[PDB]
């Protein structure tokens, strides 16, 4: 019910899996996993995916109606 | 570490808590600990009350470093 536009975004700046785990003070995993299905990032860990993305959450994660 | 404006922001916009819990479609007590101590909201959720209160979900649930 997620959309994760992190790697659309991420691509856009051309932010490194490496540089936004860093950002999140994270490991690697935890970005390659997230910008995939696999699971969503916390409210806290993808506030500061938008904070480093420097872009609102709702462009980077959005919610899907049912 | 999240810092839940939606109790301030729902107020702003005099959306009750059951309006916006009738928005989500979800039990008033969903809002009610959301917009309390209780827990965070859940990102659909928390997207869904951003989308629904017409507000970016940063404004109402910011993040914070530990």
Redesign the interface.
């Known amino acids: ?2 959309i994760n536009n992190l790697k659309l975004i991420r691509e856009k700046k051309k932010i490194s899996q490496s540089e936004l785990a860093a950002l999140l003070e994270v490991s690697r995993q935890t970005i390659n996993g997230i910008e995939k299905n696999k699971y ?2 916390s ?6 995916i ?2 480093y993305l420097n872009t ?3 462009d980077i ?4 109606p049912e």
Do not use: G
Request: proline share 11%; hydrophobic share 55%; charged share 10%.
């Open positions: 019910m997620i969503n990032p409210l806290q860990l993808a506030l500061k938008a904070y609102p959450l709702e994660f959005q919610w899907q």
